[PDB]
Ligand binder design. Sequence first.
Ligand code: CLA
Ligand code: CLA
Ligand code: CLA
Ligand code: CLA
Ligand SMILES: CC1=C(/C=C/C(C)=C/C=C/C(C)=C/C=C/C=C(C)/C=C/C=C(C)/C=C/C2=C(C)CCCC2(C)C)C(C)(C)CCC1
Ligand SMILES: CC1=C(/C=C/C(C)=C/C=C/C(C)=C/C=C/C=C(C)/C=C/C=C(C)/C=C/C2=C(C)CCCC2(C)C)C(C)(C)CCC1
Ligand SMILES: CC1=C(C/C=C(\C)CCC[C@H](C)CCC[C@H](C)CCCC(C)C)C(=O)c2ccccc2C1=O
Lengths: 41, 97, 159, 86, 741, 100
Amino acid sequence: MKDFTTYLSTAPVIATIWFTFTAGLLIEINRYFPDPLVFSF
Amino acid sequence: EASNKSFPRDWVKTDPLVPVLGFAGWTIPANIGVSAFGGQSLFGLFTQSIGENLAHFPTGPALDDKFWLYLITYHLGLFLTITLGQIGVQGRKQGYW
Amino acid sequence: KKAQVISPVNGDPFVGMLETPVTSAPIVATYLSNLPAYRTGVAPVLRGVEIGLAHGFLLAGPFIKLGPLRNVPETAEIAGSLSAAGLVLILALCLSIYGSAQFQSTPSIGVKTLSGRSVARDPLFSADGWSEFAAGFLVGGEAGVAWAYVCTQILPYYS
Amino acid sequence: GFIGSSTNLIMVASTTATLAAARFGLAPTVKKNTTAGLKLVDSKNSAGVISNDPAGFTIVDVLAMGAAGHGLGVGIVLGLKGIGAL
Amino acid sequence: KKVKIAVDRNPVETSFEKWAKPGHFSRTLSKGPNTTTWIWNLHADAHDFDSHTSDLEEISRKVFSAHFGQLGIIFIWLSGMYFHGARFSNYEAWLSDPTHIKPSAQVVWPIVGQEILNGDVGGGFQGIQITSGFFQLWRASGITSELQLYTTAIGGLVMAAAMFFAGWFHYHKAAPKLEWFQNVESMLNHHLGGLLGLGSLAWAGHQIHVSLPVNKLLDAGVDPKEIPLPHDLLLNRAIMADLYPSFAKGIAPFFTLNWSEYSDFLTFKGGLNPVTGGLWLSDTAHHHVAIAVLFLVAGHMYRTNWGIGHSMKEILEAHRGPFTGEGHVGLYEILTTSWHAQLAINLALFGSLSIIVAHHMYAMPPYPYLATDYGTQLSLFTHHTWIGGFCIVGAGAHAAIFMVRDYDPTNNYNNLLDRVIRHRDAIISHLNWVCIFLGFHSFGLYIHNDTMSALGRPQDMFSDTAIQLQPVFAQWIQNTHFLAPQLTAPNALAATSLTWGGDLVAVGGKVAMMPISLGTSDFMVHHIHAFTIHVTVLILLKGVLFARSSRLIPDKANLGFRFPCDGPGRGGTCQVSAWDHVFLGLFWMYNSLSIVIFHFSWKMQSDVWGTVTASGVSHITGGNFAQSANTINGWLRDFLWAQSSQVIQSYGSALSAYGLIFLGAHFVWAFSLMFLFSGRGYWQELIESIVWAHNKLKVAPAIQPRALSITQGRAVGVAHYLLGGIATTWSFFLARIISVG
Amino acid sequence: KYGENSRYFDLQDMENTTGSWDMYGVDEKKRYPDNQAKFFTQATDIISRRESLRALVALSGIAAIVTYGLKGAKDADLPITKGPQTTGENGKGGSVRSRL
Ligand code: CLA
Ligand code: CLA
Ligand code: CLA
Ligand code: CLA
Ligand SMILES: CC1=C(/C=C/C(C)=C/C=C/C(C)=C/C=C/C=C(C)/C=C/C=C(C)/C=C/C2=C(C)CCCC2(C)C)C(C)(C)CCC1
Ligand SMILES: CC1=C(/C=C/C(C)=C/C=C/C(C)=C/C=C/C=C(C)/C=C/C=C(C)/C=C/C2=C(C)CCCC2(C)C)C(C)(C)CCC1
Ligand SMILES: CC1=C(C/C=C(\C)CCC[C@H](C)CCC[C@H](C)CCCC(C)C)C(=O)c2ccccc2C1=O
């Protein structure tokens, strides 16, 4: 499955995975630390 | 178009029998009385409305007159019969089948 | 499956007009040939007079029945006839300046009649011919507008 | 009793009429098509198919004409039921 | 035999090695990127299968398997809708009280404060009020449970897996040969008799056995839990006989041609169910039976393998006249050899069909409690109208693609296509003239009325009071269809629609459907519609007929279907391409259907939709379409400005997403104007001045940054224009009609 | 010649070649009664030149607009010639500040 993992390394798939990751990280940060208007913690 | 150098004047190959025969093929069945018209006919009711609307000649028929239904249906069938008769006659004389 | 109707123009498939019933039906050709526009031997002033009478008479109706004073009983017809007179005057002006602009180059190719015989150019399509045509159009159009008013006044069944 | 009804006789008459019209050269069959002008002419049959009849009347022909006659008879039955003639 | 199954066995190896090589399908993209134009071309050429190869067999195989993929995706989408109705819905609550509970089948997660969109729709439920009509469709099918929706979702996922397997199978394992696709006679026989005939017959059976009894009990006040399940109606004939006595006689009346016995569940009532405001499902069942028979006889028309039937080639080659030369000779080859021709015809008729569906589903609401869900009704009309317009513009596009690529003058000599190309100047000149005449005598009427109303002369307007332009032909047709059960359809009990005339059907105090009166404003707006349609036709037909050649560019076919221009010469040849005629026909289809749906929204909110508080109907806007739709200022004031008070004041509500998408669609629309008003030469120079700054800091990419191609600039512009405008109208419509209706 | 055997190019007949045809023109000299034609050739005798016709048009149009503004607009009973016949929108400047 060298070719399949080459496909997963393509720009659109890697972009989808990375932005799902970034968006999920931000979403979980905003779930556990809701409404962060200022850096106070 | 290797033919047709001068737009032949007889572009409609006229048969004077064609209009008469389409008129008779439509209006005679259109003079058959049926159950839906109350025993009357399409041509009969159409002419009856023509008379009822010629009784006030300037005043045209109304929107609720039923003269327009008879008019449009009668002429649908009549124009169709006449054009299909012309087509059939000129296809019979010519090829086309 | 014979007898095709639509033909190339004068049998020339490369000029590009496609003679057709609406173009070359003998009734249509006759009617269009009998119009004063296509009476190439008649003086352009008289053809202009006829055309102008027709047009001045016809274009008064809209101004009469649909103008701004259409709902005033005796004023509708006067106002419409005068609007039509003004429009006819403007059109005569436009015709004059068209005759000034168009007829300066004197085309050199001759004309035929879809039969083979070359005819002379219409004197209408010259400076003098178009000037007299526009004069005739003005006279006839004002006359036809006046006659449109007269018909508003004298026709029995005018509403 | 349906067998003997007007509906039953109409239907059998219509189906047998279409079957006899096809078998005896009065209706288009598998072996005989029609031209633009409705004149029966030999077809190519697009497969070739075997029947021992003297006329080459296939069971495909029996199916086609049974369907045609069933449509005819259904229309006739229900139109006589419509105008009240049944 | 000639009509047979014909396939290649294992034509294509199932392997991931071409996934790892983007642009394998092209010889111009297999060389890898050097510029970003490659990245865009890889997506523009992905489904242009006739530019990958040139033999029709592989093209057709790719098309077949891609259709299987599309069907699998549609099945995923349908299973998702059914699943969201089974899990994230208020459907079981909505069945018990459909006149007060807002249908909702989407719940929002409480993450960034967006749980405000989970509105109080009813039924002890918080979610997004849907406008899809799925609740009414499910009630018409007789669902009455979330378990049935869940199992329909599972079946849809199974069918999606089946479709994807079938695509893989019919491309990689057993792919049909070209002679199998060119069996258009058998394809039509099966798609008429089987796809539409057996399909309509099966749905008629469902309606006989499941929908009709379930909805007859639902309309009788029976709670959905007390209703027998569909299999209890299938097994027990006594229950069905208790609901419809004709079931006591069995299927004997069908075979004895005593079909009138079935007049209990096969009716011709016409009109609407007064309990639900939808069509009688008995009429619907009879309808589906009738068209099933009709399509099953229609699917026995074409000759496939036995002598009976028609050869479509013979029909075509026999249809010719004195005006049309050889006639339809050479069209069978066109439509059996070119996929784009088939796509043109099929998209044209499919879009016209979607618009017809839109017009027929609002006037004859086929689903229960659909007519009084004004949001569902408006959204369905708007949606299917838009889909139809898009399909029609695509029909123009692919007709042009055929003319450029697959057209051959050898097979078309003096036939209808040759003779259309040979007098295209007359066609387009008369279309131009009628477009100008219609534009004047439609929009200049609005300008005349605006000028008169501004000048203080309302007696000079084209209004129902001053200068009446009454649509007397449409009024006559209305009156004729209203009086049809009396003379010309005597076995129908009522007219097809209440829009022809008569009394209103009120369901839950709200008007389901009521007579639509046509006046001067309707005349004017219908002629506006005709105008915009004629101009869209002008653009697309001019792109089709002038796709190969013109008096400006005689060798336009060699430049292709999709090219920016020929140059700044001949005065400038920008957008001479047929692709650019599609690009402009898109703008004009948008401008047409925007007015279509605006006319629908205002006419419905003014003259149909409303409440029956006392004896007397209070419409939503108050009946102001008659006197205010005469002017542009009326459409701006009394429709756009007035009805925007619900989308701009939606902040802090469950409709706040609609205001947000209103603003964002405005933004996207205006952003389209950067691509439409501009050109590539500015952006390439800006990009190179930016590439300087990237080269200075050693971050210049190896894939050289290019500006979007001219064609791609136009495509991006029109895509963003359509998206912004349509989503703006979407938000405006939905925020308005969820509040006021 | 030009119609012989699909020979649609003739150097000695460039009228038929270029399609220079009068498709509907007839050169018959006889259309109108001669007294009527005389009447209308003499009625237009003064304005049959461009300058004379434009002088007539200028005189007539200027006189017409001037008599329309001076007399004809009031004869037509135009609202702009009658005046407001009311106090008008004088004291109602704005909804807030009712200015004159
Ligand atoms: C794992 C199974 C598998 C494998 C290994 C292959 C392998 C191959 N296929 Mg086959 N194929 C399969 C399944 C498979 N296919 C199925 C299930 C179908 C039916 C749809 C097809 C239909 C098919 C056709 C019609 C063609 C191929 C082609 C190919 C070749 C390259 C395809 C490529 O570049 O893929 C990479 C491509 C993708 C990953 C795109 C997948 C797109 C999916 C189907 C739709 C998803 C849409 C998505 C929901 C949109 C979201 C929008 C977003 C904004 C949310 C290669 C030999 C092509 C070829 O030339 O072969 C020689 C060709 O023409 N295949
Ligand atoms: C009764 C037989 C029959 C039926 C029902 C269909 C149905 C269909 N065909 Mg057609 N087709 C047939 C015979 C049939 N075909 C024949 C004989 C040929 C050869 C000439 C073709 C050639 C053909 C082509 C070339 C294409 C189609 C396409 C389609 C689909 C169009 C999309 C649609 O309407 O979605 C409606 C969707 C449904 C109703 C969902 C149910 C789908 C079922 C499971 C498939 C239908 C049964 C299948 C044809 C028989 C094989 C069963 C399988 C288990 C082996 C549709 C499913 C198009 C398509 O989308 O391809 C995928 C397409 O491109 N067909
Ligand atoms: C596709 C559409 C469809 C379907 C599936 C059905 C199905 C049914 N209808 Mg409906 N119906 C329909 C359309 C349909 N109808 C339409 C259009 C009308 C209007 C005319 C009606 C009007 C109607 C009435 C008025 C009645 C029905 C009834 C029935 C039922 C009795 C079936 C029967 O006697 O026929 C006979 C059918 C068969 C003999 C086929 C069975 C074949 C099986 C499946 C073979 C499988 C064997 C297998 C090879 C071996 C076993 C497998 C394994 C265990 C080893 C059945 C549930 C009757 C009923 O009781 O309803 C509750 C009834 O009274 N229907
Ligand atoms: C049955 C429907 C159908 C089918 C099968 C095709 C098939 C085809 N079309 Mg046709 N087309 C259709 C409908 C259809 N089209 C319609 C409705 C239109 C009008 C809009 C067009 C207009 C059109 C043009 C103008 C052209 C084609 C071309 C093509 C070919 C290649 C398309 C391609 O590679 O794009 C691959 C897919 C994409 C590039 C994706 C496009 C994404 C769009 C622009 C955005 C919309 C997405 C979404 C709805 C918006 C929200 C997204 C969100 C993330 C913001 C292919 C033969 C081209 C062709 O043949 O070239 C020679 C061509 O030039 N088509
Ligand atoms: C052996 C033989 C014989 C006899 C035979 C027989 C007797 C046969 C029969 C046959 C038959 C007896 C057939 C039948 C068929 C039928 C069919 C084929 C049916 C069909 C049906 C259908 C198709 C339906 C349809 C429909 C419906 C369901 C509904 C309504 C509409 C319609 C109509 C569409 C002879 C002569 C002696 C001699 C030798 C040989
Ligand atoms: C919704 C949906 C779903 C489901 C669906 C279904 C469930 C369907 C079904 C369907 C069906 C369930 C169908 C059926 C059909 C049937 C049929 C179609 C039948 C027919 C019959 C006939 C045609 C007959 C004929 C005849 C007669 C009449 C008598 C004797 C002889 C003979 C046999 C010839 C799913 C999950 C996918 C998902 C998506 C959506
Ligand atoms: C704005 C504009 C541009 C410039 C637009 C650029 C070139 C396209 C930008 C698309 C995206 C932003 C670039 C894609 C880069 C990566 C794929 C994104 C991945 C990383 C992100 C997180 C940044 C044109 O090239 C153009 C050409 C012809 C007519 C009009 C116009 C036009 O209006």
